[PDB]
Design a protein around this ligand. Structure first.
Ligand SMILES: *[C@@H]1O[C@H](CO)[C@@H](O)[C@H](O)[C@H]1NC(C)=O
Lengths: 195, 596
């Protein structure tokens, strides 16, 4: 009867780059999701499965809290059946997704004058990601026919790049911290319940 | 695999690098256009150096994908725009020479100073020596300021401008253009789009045809203004001669705005200038731009971003240093929009604010386009969008409903003529000036004007086309073209001509959407979402479509037409026709203020 460590997920000092999105497994604990909803400190809190008001009265065998940072414009891609750079090459939610996408504006932490470049995203990849896939490779993407020999050049570009987060950017280009909560339901008994 | 796919991949890479580099360059330029310190000049130059080198590299990269093997048209357009070296096609020596020439010319312009023979009181174009040209009625002061400017600052620019023409002609010819003027006309070019194409000399022809149609209105405005000014300058103006250049309202005669005081038709009825009422209701620049935002919102357009209000400089730096005041609208990228304008509590800056915020509205509209397609269709589409806002915002009504024109005030025949005469002094007066200046530039670049007649032909063209004569005979030592801002800092000028033509097609089609009744000049598009919806269908395009089309998305046509301009000013046309039924409409190019 211990509490779920959602605090170290949402209140984490640094988040992951979206290409290397960070997963935490949540088990053997009691969660009060209604406090996460009624925090009202979020710009996006969209549940594509259960109603956010209710999950305090539900049990699951496991919860997966994925977290990363993207641009505000890109937050619409953290959803089922979305295309674009984040949903194709970085973080692809499945079509039958049954969790919630939470996201808030992290201007006051993840941006700074001169440029916060800590955060990356994958720009090229030979094919799209499978649901909940995670690719952290830094192999040179070969756009043309000549091999790249592990160095950038003509038709050879390093796959990952950086978000330049400046405090004077537009809201579409401001850093947003994203946490996706996935609720899984196997015949296994439930180690995560509301209340 | 295919070449078009590699082109897509390369363009994506370019987009994501160029966002950051553009924001660096724009932010350094903003910090210098707001702090103006040696340090800021250095940072500005370094950011722009990184930026320009990245472009030379990326243009070399983009030429490696042949346009021949590409079919998706937006990709083709981004690659064509990316495949252009500009000044880079010159040798390193020639490019550095050209950049130093541009720098010296710009600094000569910005720091040029002359001294009142009276005392010394050196006065630079800024405030004084401009204040004179806009406020003085003393013939001698105007003449001294005009001639001293064109002698003390123009004579410095003459050899620099000669070498400038030489080098930049070499640049254009290296880019397979026939001359630098054709290199500028290449903005309106449209290729590979059936029924929508457009050539670089078709602009020549269309501009000259539209100006042929403009000439009668301008001739009668010229006759009437010459009549009023002859009333106020008896011994100085021939009734059949051309207008002396130094008596035109500003340092060049670019706009006849400041002549309203001496030329207003009905001087005993409410003159249209809220300059006082704004002062009496205690308006600041904050209120001015808030009202502009309210205007745009009333039409279906979004509010300004909060970053706009926080980062923009709307007021002369109270205790900061320098700061350039030329009203400019900044699209730094990364959703960051700002406006730099040393706003005064006047009607003039009140209209300029709507103009610049319309620029920003365009920038915000096409911000979803790829970075290479984030621009007004041609060089003019931006300025015409800016000007239709001032057209609407200057209407007696708009000022009435804004609480800046006494609601108890009748839009009678005579106030409408007064408003038309002011609007024509500003808009119509600049058209022959602009066409003539750009024509002179075009001929100098094409090589049709020899150096030893450069100015002789400058003034002939002033007498013939503009109806304006120099008050002092100028030898080729002078360089009066380079005495205007845009000439001395390498800016195309025909964009203001084409702005004025497009802005009345737009403003007609938008006033048809807004269900406006009466003469087109009294139109107000406020409170009409159908008008703004129609305008956004073009704005959001950016240049992802040849301007011909965008233009169809508003006015339905794809041609440059003066007929809307003439419909706007038709009432003042007939009134001027009546107030000249017994005057001499036209001018003789022989009379000068110095031939007796
Ligand atoms: C994070 O900190 C807030 C206090 O600002 C606290 O109310 C909350 O419980 C913490 N954890 C989460 C998951 O929000």
């Amino acid at each position: 009867t211990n509490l779920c460590p959602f605090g170290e997920v949402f209140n984490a000092t640094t988040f992951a780059s979206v290409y290397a999105w960070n997963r935490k497994r949540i088990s053997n604990c009691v969660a009060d999701y209604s406090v996460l909803y009624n925090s009202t400190s979020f710009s996006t809190f969209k549940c594509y499965g259960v109603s956010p008001t209710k999950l305090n009265d539900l049990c699951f065998t496991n919860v997966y809290a994925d977290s990363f940072v993207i641009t505000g414009d890109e937050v619409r891609q953290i959803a089922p059946g979305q295309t674009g750079k984040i949903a194709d090459y970085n973080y692809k939610l499945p079509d039958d997704f049954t969790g919630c996408v939470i996201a808030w504006n992290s201007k006051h932490i993840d941006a700074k004058e001169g440029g916060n470049f800590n955060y990356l995203y994958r720009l090229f990849r030979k094919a799209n990601l499978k649901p909940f896939e995670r690719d952290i490779s830094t192999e040179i993407y070969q756009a043309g026919s000549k091999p790249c020999n592990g160095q950038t050049g003509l038709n050879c570009y390093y796959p990952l790049y950086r978000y330049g987060f400046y405090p004077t950017d537009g809201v579409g280009h401001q850093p947003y911290r994203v946490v996706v909560l996935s609720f899984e339901l196997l015949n296994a008994p439930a180690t995560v319940c509301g209340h | 695999s295919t070449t078009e796919g590699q082109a897509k991949t390369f363009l994506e890479k370019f987009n994501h690098e160029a966002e950051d580099l553009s924001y660096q360059s724009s932010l350094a330029s903003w910090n210098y256009n707001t702090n103006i310190t040696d340090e800021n000049v250095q940072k500005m130059n370094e950011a722009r150096a990184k930026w320009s080198a990245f472009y030379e590299e990326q243009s070399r990269m983009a030429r490696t994908y042949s346009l021949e093997e590409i079919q998706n048209l937006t990709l083709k357009r981004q690659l064509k725009a990316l495949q252009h070296s500009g000044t880079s096609v010159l040798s390193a020596e020639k490019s550095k020479r050209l950049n130093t020439i541009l720098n010296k010319m710009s600094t000569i312009y910005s720091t040029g100073k002359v001294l009142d023979p009276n005392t010394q009181e050196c006065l630079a174009l800024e405030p004084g020596l401009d204040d004179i040209m806009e406020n003085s009625r003393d013939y001698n002061r105007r003449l001294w300021a005009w001639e001293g400017w064109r002698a003390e600052v123009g004579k410095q620019l003459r050899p620099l401008y000669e070498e400038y023409v030489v080098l930049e002609n070499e640049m254009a010819r290296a880019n397979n253009y026939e001359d630098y003027g054709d290199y500028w006309r290449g903005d309106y070019e449209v290729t590979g789009a059936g029924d929508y194409d457009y050539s670089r000399d078709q602009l020549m022809k269309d501009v000259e045809r539209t100006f042929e149609e403009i000439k009668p209105l301008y001739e009668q405005l010229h006759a009437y203004v010459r009549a009023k000014l002859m009333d106020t300058y008896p011994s100085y103006i021939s009734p059949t001669g051309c207008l002396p250049a130094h008596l035109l309202g500003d340092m060049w005669g670019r706009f006849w705005t400041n002549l309203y005081s001496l030329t207003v038709p009905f001087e005993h009825k409410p003159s249209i200038d809220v300059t006082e009422k704004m002062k009496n209701q205690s308006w600041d620049a904050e209120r001015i731009f808030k009202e502009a935002e309210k205007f745009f919102v009333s039409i279906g357009l979004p509010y300004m971003t909060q970053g706009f209000w926080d980062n923009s400089m709307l007021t002369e730096p109270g205790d900061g240093r320098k700061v350039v005041c030329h009203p400019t609208a900044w699209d730094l990228g990364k959703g960051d929009f700002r406006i730099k304008m040393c706003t005064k509590v006047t009607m003039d800056d009140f209209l300029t604010a709507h103009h610049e915020m319309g620029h920003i509205q365009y920038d915000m509209a096409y911000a979803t386009q790829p970075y290479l397609l984030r621009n007004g269709a041609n060089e003019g589409f931006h300025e015409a969008v800016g000007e239709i806002m001032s057209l609407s915002a200057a209407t007696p009504h708009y000022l009435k409903a804004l609480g800046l024109l006494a609601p108890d005030f009748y839009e009678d025949n005579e106030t409408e003529i007064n408003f038309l005469l002011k609007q024509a002094l500003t808009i119509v007066g600049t058209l022959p000036f602009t066409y003539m200046l750009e024509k002179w530039r075009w001929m100098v670049f094409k090589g049709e004007i020899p150096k030893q007649q450069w100015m002789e032909k400058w003034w002939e063209m002033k007498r013939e086309i503009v109806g304006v004569v120099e008050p002092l005979p100028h030898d080729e030592t002078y360089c009066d073209p380079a005495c205007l801002f845009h000439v001395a800092e390498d800016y195309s000028f025909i964009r203001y001509y084409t702005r004025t033509i497009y802005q009345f097609q737009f403003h007609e089609a938008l006033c048809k959407t807004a269900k406006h009744e009466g003469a087109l000049f009294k139109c107000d598009i406020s409170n009409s979402t159908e008008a703004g919806q129609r305008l956004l269908q073009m704005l959001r395009l950016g240049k992802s479509e040849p301007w011909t089309l965008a233009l169809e998305n508003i006015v339905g046509i794809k041609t440059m037409d003066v007929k809307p301009l003439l419909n706007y000013f038709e009432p003042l046309f007939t009134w001027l026709k009546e107030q000249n039924r017994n005057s001499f409409v036209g001018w003789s190019t022989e009379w000068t203020p110095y031939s007796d």
